[PDB]
Design an enzyme around this catalytic site. Sequence first.
Site, PDB file in Angstrom:
ATOM      1  N   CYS A 153       2.960  -5.015   6.572  1.00  0.00           N
ATOM      2  CA  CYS A 153       2.678  -4.664   5.204  1.00  0.00           C
ATOM      3  C   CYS A 153       3.875  -4.073   4.479  1.00  0.00           C
ATOM      4  O   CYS A 153       4.859  -3.621   5.084  1.00  0.00           O
ATOM      5  CB  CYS A 153       1.473  -3.712   5.161  1.00  0.00           C
ATOM      6  SG  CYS A 153       0.021  -4.623   5.740  1.00  0.00           S
ATOM      7  N   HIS A 185       0.791  -1.219   0.000  1.00  0.00           N
ATOM      8  CA  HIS A 185       0.000   0.000   0.000  1.00  0.00           C
ATOM      9  C   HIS A 185       0.826   1.271   0.000  1.00  0.00           C
ATOM     10  O   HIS A 185       2.020   1.246   0.234  1.00  0.00           O
ATOM     11  CB  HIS A 185      -0.989  -0.006   1.183  1.00  0.00           C
ATOM     12  CG  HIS A 185      -0.343   0.149   2.530  1.00  0.00           C
ATOM     13  ND1 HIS A 185       0.050   1.367   3.040  1.00  0.00           N
ATOM     14  CD2 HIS A 185      -0.009  -0.770   3.465  1.00  0.00           C
ATOM     15  CE1 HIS A 185       0.614   1.194   4.218  1.00  0.00           C
ATOM     16  NE2 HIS A 185       0.587  -0.096   4.500  1.00  0.00           N
TER      17      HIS A 185
END
EC number: 2.3.2.-
Length: 259
Positions: free
Chosen positions: A205, A187
């Site tokens: 992440c 992301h």
Amino acid sequence: HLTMPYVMPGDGEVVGVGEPVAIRFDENIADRGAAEKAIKITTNPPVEGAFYWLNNREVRWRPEHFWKPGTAVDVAVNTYGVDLGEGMFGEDNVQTHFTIGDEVIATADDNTKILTVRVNGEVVKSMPTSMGKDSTPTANGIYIVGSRYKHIIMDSSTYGVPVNSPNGYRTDVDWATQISYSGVFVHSAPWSVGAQGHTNTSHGCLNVSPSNAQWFYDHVKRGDIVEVVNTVGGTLPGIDGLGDWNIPWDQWRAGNAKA
């Protein structure tokens, strides 16, 4: 005492080289072998594959290696009126035809802190990345790309973890591509652009720049592959939901139909 199968990918889809065939039933299957025998997969060019159950309701089929680009796949789930054990019968047949797209493999290397995207072997993007900090590292292994989101409110309570507790988090993010059912994403992270390529700062992440995250959202598709290497983490579980390739072929092929 009827169960309805659902097959993915959907009819007419084009998916990446890591995408398994998935047959999801809406009831626990007592006789897994009965379900497997009712499901026939045709491939062109032909390749060997095998079934492995991710849970009591969902079976996956895939080859030993990533699919060859351009392969056409037909799935015939011939479960109508089939006894699936404990008096449970298949409600319907389902069918699907899908195709394997380009080979898209993105490798996140913690020794370089670069995520490199290769399409049919050729580098098309090099993205500095910031991955999980040492206390919450990104697991190494092979991840299958899933859904994508223009914006998502990432909230650990989704996964049963309170936000204000040791493993919790809450973060509004843009351009998120899902790579595990456990909640790992690639992301946008504008606030960590300095650290990208240098230091790991996340909860697990893969943080990249806004333009790189949007590129990834735009050009990496369901079934494409992300490989993470050289982190201080463990390995992604084989039964995550998008972790199928972390089960070695000898184990996958042996299956788990009598379990």
